[PDB]
Amino acid sequence: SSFKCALTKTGFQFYYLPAVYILVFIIGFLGNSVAIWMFVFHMKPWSGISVYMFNLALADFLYVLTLPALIFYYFNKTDWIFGDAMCKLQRFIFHVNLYGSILFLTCISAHRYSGVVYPLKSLGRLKKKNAICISVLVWLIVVVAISPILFYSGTGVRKNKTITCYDTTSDEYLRSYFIYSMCTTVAMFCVPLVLILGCYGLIVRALIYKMKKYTCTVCGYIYNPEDGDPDNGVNPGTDFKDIPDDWVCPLCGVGKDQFEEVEEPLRRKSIYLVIIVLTVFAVSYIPFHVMKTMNLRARLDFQTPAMCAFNDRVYATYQVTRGLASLNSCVNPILYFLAGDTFRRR
Numbered sequence: 001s002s003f004k005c006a007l008t009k010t011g012f013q014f015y016y017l018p019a020v021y022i023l024v025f026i027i028g029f030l031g032n033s034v035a036i037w038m039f040v041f042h043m044k045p046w047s048g049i050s051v052y053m054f055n056l057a058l059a060d061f062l063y064v065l066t067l068p069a070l071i072f073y074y075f076n077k078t079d080w081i082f083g084d085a086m087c088k089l090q091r092f093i094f095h096v097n098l099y100g101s102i103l104f105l106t107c108i109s110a111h112r113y114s115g116v117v118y119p120l121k122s123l124g125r126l127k128k129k130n131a132i133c134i135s136v137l138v139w140l141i142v143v144v145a146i147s148p149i150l151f152y153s154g155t156g157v158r159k160n161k162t163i164t165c166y167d168t169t170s171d172e173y174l175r176s177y178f179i180y181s182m183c184t185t186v187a188m189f190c191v192p193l194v195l196i197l198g199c200y201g202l203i204v205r206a207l208i209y210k211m212k213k214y215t216c217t218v219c220g221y222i223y224n225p226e227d228g229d230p231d232n233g234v235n236p237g238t239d240f241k242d243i244p245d246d247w248v249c250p251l252c253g254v255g256k257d258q259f260e261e262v263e264e265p266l267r268r269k270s271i272y273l274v275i276i277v278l279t280v281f282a283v284s285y286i287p288f289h290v291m292k293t294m295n296l297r298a299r300l301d302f303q304t305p306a307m308c309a310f311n312d313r314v315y316a317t318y319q320v321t322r323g324l325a326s327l328n329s330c331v332n333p334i335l336y337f338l339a340g341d342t343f344r345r346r
C-alpha cells in the first residue's frame, strides 16, 4: 500500500499564527490605508517611484482584507467553511500580492539604480508614463502567471470530515503543480532577487565613489568636486577635505569652516531601500520559497517511514515561513516614507 507519513498540527497553527495575522491585519490596514491616502491625494506630481510604490500599497491593502477569513480558518482548527470559490480567491490574492510585490520592488530598485548610476542620461526612461505602462504590465504578467492557482487550489474533505483549503493542490495534481511552482519561483523570485542584488551592488558602488558637495553658509555657493575650483588652483576632482585650510569661498571670501555638507536626499533613500528590501527578502520571501519547495518535495519524493519525523519538522517550518510571508504588508509602509519621494521638496 502507498505509505503516507503521519502529520502533526501544532498550537502555532490553531492559536498563535491566527493571533499574528490579527496584528498584521490591524497594523497592515492602518499602514497602507494611510499610505494610499498620502499618494492618491498628496503626492502628485508622482515620479515613477510613487507610481510603483502606490501599486505596492494597493496590493498590500487588498491582501490584508483577506486576513479575517484566514484568521477564522486557523481558529476553526483549519476547517474551511466559505466554500471552494472563496478558497481559490484567498490563495490567488495571496500569490498575486506575493509576486506583485517582488516585481514592484524590482522596478523600484531598477528605477533607483538608473537615477543613481546614470544621473544625467536616464531622465527619459524614468518618466511617469513609462512607470504606469510598466505597472500595468507587472499586473498583467502576475495575473497571467498566477492564474493557474485558481485551478490547482480549492477545497477538499479530510478523513476526520473537516475541510481543507489547499494553498498548493491535492495529491492527484501535485506533479504538475511542482513543475509550475518551480517556474514561478525561478522566474518571479530567483531572477528578480538576482536583478535586485545586481542593482544594489552597483548603487552602493556609485554612492561610495560619489564625492560630497559642500555649500557656503554665508553666500550659498556650492563647491562641486567634479568641477573643482580651477581658477583658484583646485583641480577638477578634488574632495573638499583635501582643500588646504587657506582656501576661501570664491564668491565672498569666508573660510572653509563656514562651509557645510550638502544633504543628498537620493543617497539616503537608496540606502534605506537596500537595507529594508534585503531585510524583507531574508525574513519573508527567501525562507518561504526555500520551505515551500522542500515541503512539496517531502510530499512527493520523501514519503517513507524513516523520513516522517524530518518531514513534519519541514511541514512545521513551512507553516512559520508561510506566516512570515505576510509581514511585508505591515513593513512596506516604512518603505513608502523612508525610501520613496519626499513630500514636496519645494
Ligand SMILES: CNc1nc(I)nc2c1ncn2[C@H]1C[C@H](OP(=O)(O)O)[C@]2(COP(=O)(O)O)C[C@H]12
Residues within 6 Å of the ligand: 004, 005, 006, 007, 078, 164, 165, 166, 167, 168, 169, 170, 295, 296, 298, 299, 311, 312, 314, 315
Ligand atoms: C512534509 N509535508 C507534508 N507531508 C505530508 I504526509 N502531508 C502534507 C505535507 N504538507 C502538506 N501536507 C498535507 C496536509 C495539508 O492539509 P492541512 O490543512 O495541513 O491539514 C495539505 C496541503 O496543505 P497546503 O501545503 O496546500 O497549505 C494536503 C497536504
Ligand SMILES: [Zn+2]
Residues within 6 Å of the ligand: 216, 218, 219, 220, 221, 249, 250, 251, 252, 253, 254
Ligand atoms: Zn561664500
